[PDB]
Design a protein around this ligand. Structure first.
Ligand SMILES: COc1cc2nc(N3CCN(C(=O)[C@H]4CCCO4)CC3)nc(N)c2cc1OC
Length: 417
């Protein structure tokens, strides 16, 4: 599942070549400024390698948010990323106000040696995703000839193509699968990410522990099912736990998150766990709240006491953290996708923070620890543990596709060796 069969950047001859590189620069924003640059830094090694090995230019392309194929320069512009990238590179970045057309092509045709260029959001064009919404809010499908022309234009921007956009690798979008150049290479971030998950999924050090949390469970079914064939141990925490608790223990869970459809398959999941010899760890106690608010009134519950009606479980308790800690301590490899409580609120972050402490300690004694993207990675940013675990994935949705046993279109479209 690694890039072993695919052309990679390190094997790419880029001296005197223009490199058009798809990156995932879809960073979280607030008020026109970046609040997490993790995805930008993650791409720096590929960019730096190109500049260091005599590349004539590196033309960077990405999307930002979901403008749905309409230009939205005042809401979703990549301009700020240009500024941040220049800061990280110690080098000028030229921002272009479009990503195709004659003028874009002319700026990229033959740039001064060492030029870094960043194009405007790819998704301002419906041809990128192949569908979107018009100015009026009607859903639209892109036209075949225009899609090819969009792709033909992106292709003109470089002599060789690098995809470093792991976070977007599950999207079969034009910049990801439709660039037509003789060499199509995986970048250093693509290789890194794929190497971490490939080992986790094919050849992990064992016991292999999966920590699965976050809110809803229906979207987690094929995920749990698939992981049950890979792991030796699984923590099921956060929002999903209450559906299990209710089915398995007849727990009264108040207004806690509950997934009726998922309830139907919980016993089958547990049978599968048992059959495969997977130890499942569910929480046994909770921090409760009288409503979904950062300031709600709080309380405590266990599985036996139940959660009072009107109240909801928003975090696991001290005893739960203990059991989580024990599974972590046994692990030699860990993939963690989903916090185990409402981490962004102080009253409900103890469990996720405590788990993070264990995962860092686990890393310190040699455990391979993989943090999926999304909220979990945000937690790493929040508590400054980005360099204290083995790998913080840049791809939450993409890493999830891999954990479910699915293929990544962005990877398959790379040149074969
Ligand atoms: C224990 O772990 C978690 C529990 C979570 N619970 C919730 N909800 C969200 C919304 N909920 C409610 O509004 C209550 C009150 C009205 C409906 O039931 C139910 C509790 N949301 C979340 N986002 C939750 C996330 C969690 O971990 C990440």
């Amino acid at each position: 599942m690694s890039l072993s069969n695919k052309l990679t950047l390190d094997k790419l001859d880029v001296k005197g070549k223009r490199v058009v590189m798809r990156v995932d620069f879809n960073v979280p924003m607030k008020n026109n400024q970046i609040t997490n640059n993790q995805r930008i830094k993650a791409a720096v090694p590929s960019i730096k390698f190109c500049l260091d090995n005599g590349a004539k230019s590196v033309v960077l392309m990405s999307h930002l948010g979901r403008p749905d194929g309409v230009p939205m320069p005042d809401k979703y512009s990549l301009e700020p990323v240009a500024v941040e990238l220049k800061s990280l590179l110690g080098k000028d970045v030229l921002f272009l106000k479009d990503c195709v057309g004659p003028e874009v092509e002319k700026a990229c045709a033959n740039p001064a040696a060492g030029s870094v260029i960043l194009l405007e959001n790819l998704r301002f064009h419906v041809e990128e995703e192949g569908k979107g919404k018009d100015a009026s809010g009607n859903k639209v499908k892109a036209e075949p000839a225009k899609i090819e022309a969009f792709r033909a234009s992106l292709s003109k921007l470089g002599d060789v193509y690098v995809n470093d956009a792991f976070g977007t690798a599950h999207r079969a979008h034009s910049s990801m699968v439709g660039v037509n150049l003789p060499q199509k290479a995986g970048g250093f971030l693509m290789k890194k990410e794929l190497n971490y998950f490939a080992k986790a999924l094919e050849s992990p050090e064992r016991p292999f522990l999966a920590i699965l949390g976050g809110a809803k469970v229906a979207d987690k079914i094929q995920l749990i099912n698939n992981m049950l064939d890979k792991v030796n141990e699984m923590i099921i925490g956060g929002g999903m736990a209450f559906t299990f608790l209710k089915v398995l223990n007849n727990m009264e869970i108040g207004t806690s998150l509950f997934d009726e459809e998922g309830a139907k398959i919980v016993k089958d999941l547990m049978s599968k766990a048992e059959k495969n010899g997977v130890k499942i760890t569910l929480p046994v106690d909770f921090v409760t709240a009288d409503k979904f608010d950062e300031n709600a009134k709080t309380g405590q519950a266990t599985v036996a006491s139940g959660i009072p009606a009107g109240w909801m479980g928003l975090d696991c308790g001290p005893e739960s953290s203990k059991k989580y800690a024990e599974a972590v301590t046994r692990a030699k490899q860990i993939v963690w996708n989903g916090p185990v409580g409402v981490f962004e609120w102080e009253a409900f972050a103890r469990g996720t923070k405590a788990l993070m402490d264990e995962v860092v300690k686990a890393t310190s004694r040699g455990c391979i620890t993989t943090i999926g993207g999304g909220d979990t990675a945000t937690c790493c940013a929040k508590w400054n543990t980005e360099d204290k675990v083995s790998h913080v994935s840049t791809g939450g949705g993409a890493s999830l596709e891999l954990l479910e046993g699915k293929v990544l279109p962005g990877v398959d479209a790379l040149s074969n060796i």
